Protein backbone atom coordinates (compact mmCIF):
# COMPACT_ATOMS: atom_id res chain seq x y z
CA UNK A 1 0.00 0.00 0.00
CA UNK A 2 1.43 3.35 -1.16
CA UNK A 3 4.99 2.07 -1.32
CA UNK A 4 4.87 0.24 2.02
CA UNK A 5 5.19 -3.55 1.80
CA UNK A 6 3.52 -5.00 4.90
CA UNK A 7 4.26 -8.56 6.04
CA UNK A 8 2.02 -10.26 8.60
CA UNK A 9 2.45 -13.70 10.12
CA UNK A 10 1.53 -16.07 12.91
CA UNK A 11 2.78 -19.56 13.75
CA UNK A 12 0.66 -22.16 15.48
CA UNK A 13 1.20 -25.84 16.31
CA UNK A 14 -1.76 -27.75 14.87
CA UNK A 15 -2.98 -31.33 14.74
CA UNK A 16 -5.32 -31.45 11.69
CA UNK A 17 -3.45 -33.34 8.98
CA UNK A 18 -4.45 -31.45 5.85
CA UNK A 19 -6.61 -28.39 6.48
CA UNK A 20 -7.09 -25.33 8.63
CA UNK A 21 -8.52 -26.29 12.03
CA UNK A 22 -11.84 -24.75 12.97
CA UNK A 23 -10.75 -21.84 15.13
CA UNK A 24 -9.62 -18.27 15.02
CA UNK A 25 -6.37 -16.35 15.45
CA UNK A 26 -4.92 -13.04 14.31
CA UNK A 27 -1.72 -12.36 12.39
CA UNK A 28 1.02 -10.17 13.83
CA UNK A 29 2.34 -7.04 12.09
CA UNK A 30 6.02 -8.06 11.94
CA UNK A 31 7.48 -5.54 9.51
CA UNK A 32 6.26 -2.78 7.18
CA UNK A 33 9.10 -2.36 4.72
CA UNK A 34 9.66 0.96 2.88
CA UNK A 35 9.70 -0.77 -0.50
CA UNK A 36 9.06 1.67 -3.33
CA UNK A 37 8.23 -0.58 -6.29
CA UNK A 38 5.13 -1.98 -8.00
CA UNK A 39 4.00 -5.59 -7.64
CA UNK A 40 1.42 -7.39 -9.77
CA UNK A 41 2.77 -10.95 -10.15
CA UNK A 42 4.51 -13.30 -7.74
CA UNK A 43 6.04 -16.73 -7.16
CA UNK A 44 6.74 -19.04 -4.21
CA UNK A 45 10.21 -20.38 -3.49
CA UNK A 46 10.14 -23.97 -2.30
CA UNK A 47 12.48 -26.59 -0.87
CA UNK A 48 13.09 -29.65 -3.03
CA UNK A 49 14.14 -33.06 -1.72
Amino acid sequence: IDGYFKIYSKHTPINLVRDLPQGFSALEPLVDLPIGINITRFQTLLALH
Binding site: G3, Y4, P34, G36
Partner: protein, 46 residues
Protein backbone atom coordinates in the same frame (compact mmCIF):
# COMPACT_ATOMS: atom_id res chain seq x y z
CA UNK B 1 38.92 13.26 -25.53
CA UNK B 2 40.14 12.92 -21.93
CA UNK B 3 43.32 14.50 -20.55
CA UNK B 4 45.19 13.67 -17.36
CA UNK B 5 45.16 15.79 -14.19
CA UNK B 6 48.73 17.02 -13.77
CA UNK B 7 48.76 16.73 -9.98
CA UNK B 8 52.38 17.22 -8.97
CA UNK B 9 53.62 15.74 -5.65
CA UNK B 10 54.34 19.19 -4.23
CA UNK B 11 47.51 26.54 -3.21
CA UNK B 12 44.94 27.08 -5.95
CA UNK B 13 46.24 23.97 -7.72
CA UNK B 14 46.17 21.91 -4.52
CA UNK B 15 43.95 18.79 -4.44
CA UNK B 16 40.69 19.66 -2.68
CA UNK B 17 38.56 16.67 -1.66
CA UNK B 18 34.92 17.39 -2.52
CA UNK B 19 31.76 15.54 -1.50
CA UNK B 20 28.42 16.34 -3.15
CA UNK B 21 25.24 15.40 -1.29
CA UNK B 22 22.54 15.04 -3.95
CA UNK B 23 19.19 14.52 -2.24
CA UNK B 24 16.51 12.41 -3.91
CA UNK B 25 13.28 13.63 -2.30
CA UNK B 26 10.59 11.91 -4.40
CA UNK B 27 11.93 8.65 -5.91
CA UNK B 28 11.21 6.72 -2.68
CA UNK B 29 9.58 7.04 0.72
CA UNK B 30 11.45 9.14 3.26
CA UNK B 31 14.45 7.30 4.67
CA UNK B 32 16.95 9.74 6.27
CA UNK B 33 16.09 12.18 9.06
CA UNK B 34 18.23 14.10 11.52
CA UNK B 35 18.23 12.89 15.11
CA UNK B 36 16.81 15.07 17.85
CA UNK B 37 17.22 15.27 21.63
CA UNK B 38 14.62 13.66 23.90
CA UNK B 39 13.48 14.79 27.36
CA UNK B 40 12.86 13.16 30.75
CA UNK B 41 9.43 11.99 31.88
CA UNK B 42 7.58 13.69 34.73
CA UNK B 43 4.68 11.96 36.48
CA UNK B 44 1.40 13.34 37.86
CA UNK B 45 1.88 16.68 36.07
CA UNK B 46 -0.03 18.25 33.19
Amino acid sequence: PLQSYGFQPTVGYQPYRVVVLSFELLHAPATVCGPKKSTNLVKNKC
